[PDB]
Design an enzyme around this catalytic site. Structure first.
Site, PDB file in Angstrom:
ATOM      1  N   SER A   1      -1.031 -35.398 -10.097  1.00  0.00           N
ATOM      2  CA  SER A   1      -0.765 -36.793 -10.376  1.00  0.00           C
ATOM      3  C   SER A   1      -0.424 -36.945 -11.855  1.00  0.00           C
ATOM      4  CB  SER A   1      -1.954 -37.655  -9.999  1.00  0.00           C
ATOM      5  OG  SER A   1      -3.079 -37.308 -10.775  1.00  0.00           O
TER       6      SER A   1
ATOM      7  N   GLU B   1      -6.334 -44.228 -24.839  1.00  0.00           N
ATOM      8  CA  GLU B   1      -5.550 -43.735 -23.694  1.00  0.00           C
ATOM      9  C   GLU B   1      -4.107 -43.401 -24.084  1.00  0.00           C
ATOM     10  OE1 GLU B   1      -6.495 -42.834 -20.863  1.00  0.00           O
ATOM     11  OE2 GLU B   1      -8.472 -43.741 -20.620  1.00  0.00           O
TER      12      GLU B   1
ATOM     13  N   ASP C   1      -4.376 -32.167 -10.797  1.00  0.00           N
ATOM     14  CA  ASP C   1      -4.121 -32.326  -9.368  1.00  0.00           C
ATOM     15  C   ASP C   1      -2.667 -32.649  -9.046  1.00  0.00           C
ATOM     16  OD1 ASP C   1      -3.908 -35.012 -10.084  1.00  0.00           O
ATOM     17  OD2 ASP C   1      -5.546 -35.686  -8.791  1.00  0.00           O
TER      18      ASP C   1
ATOM     19  N   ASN D   1      -1.814 -34.699 -14.771  1.00  0.00           N
ATOM     20  CA  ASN D   1      -3.180 -34.280 -14.431  1.00  0.00           C
ATOM     21  C   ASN D   1      -3.135 -32.965 -13.654  1.00  0.00           C
ATOM     22  OD1 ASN D   1      -3.564 -37.739 -13.550  1.00  0.00           O
ATOM     23  ND2 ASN D   1      -4.307 -36.797 -15.441  1.00  0.00           N
TER      24      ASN D   1
ATOM     25  N   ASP E   1      -0.483 -39.958 -15.201  1.00  0.00           N
ATOM     26  CA  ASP E   1      -0.930 -41.216 -15.779  1.00  0.00           C
ATOM     27  C   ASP E   1       0.211 -41.874 -16.550  1.00  0.00           C
ATOM     28  OD1 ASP E   1      -3.442 -40.790 -14.763  1.00  0.00           O
ATOM     29  OD2 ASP E   1      -4.326 -40.171 -16.682  1.00  0.00           O
TER      30      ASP E   1
ATOM     31  N   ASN F   1      -3.087 -44.102 -13.000  1.00  0.00           N
ATOM     32  CA  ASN F   1      -2.881 -42.817 -12.327  1.00  0.00           C
ATOM     33  C   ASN F   1      -2.174 -42.956 -10.983  1.00  0.00           C
ATOM     34  OD1 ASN F   1      -4.159 -40.804 -10.102  1.00  0.00           O
ATOM     35  ND2 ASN F   1      -3.979 -39.763 -12.084  1.00  0.00           N
TER      36      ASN F   1
END
Ligand SMILES: [Cl-]
Ligand SMILES: [Cl-]
Ligand code: NA
Ligand code: NA
Length: 129
Positions: A50, A35, A48, A46, A52, A59
């Site tokens: 958002s 990750e 959309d 991301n 992380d 998220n």
């Protein structure tokens, strides 16, 4: 802070992640490697809108507040910036909530694609724990 492999394993063990909800320590170390490459400062946007955050790429769409993810929840009740600290407590405590929500570690895409079904104990081999 960029952790070493065994240093992170030891930190996660003390924070109670070994066998948490049945996931052995190597699962958590493997997830963190893929990750974030063990970097607490990691961020990634991301599609959309958002973002992380941190060692476990938590998220903002559901788990933390970053002030720029409209309509999102804050289920860990924390600013997303707290997940970038060199102290992993906030990331660990939020991860315990995520892994307990019904889908286990499948919530972490990299875990499902790169750790699940592999010899994850290799990630803690050699470490003084
Ligand atoms: Cl820590
Ligand atoms: Cl599970
Ligand atoms: Na393990
Ligand atoms: Na949010």
């Amino acid at each position: 802070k960029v952790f070493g492999r065994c240093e992170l394993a030891a930190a996660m063990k003390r924070h109670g992640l070994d066998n948490y909800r049945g996931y052995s320590l190597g699962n958590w170390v493997c997830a963190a490697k893929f990750e974030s490459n063990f970097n607490t400062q990691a961020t990634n946007r991301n599609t959309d809108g958002s973002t992380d955050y941190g060692i476990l790429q938590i998220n903002s769409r559901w788990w933390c507040n970053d002030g720029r993810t409209p309509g999102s929840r804050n289920l860990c009740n924390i600013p997303c910036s707290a997940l970038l600290s060199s102290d992993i407590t906030a990331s660990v405590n939020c991860a315990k909530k995520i892994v307990s929500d019904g889908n286990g570690m499948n919530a972490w895409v990299a875990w499902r694609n790169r750790c699940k079904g592999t010899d994850v104990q290799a990630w803690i081999r050699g470490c003084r724990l």
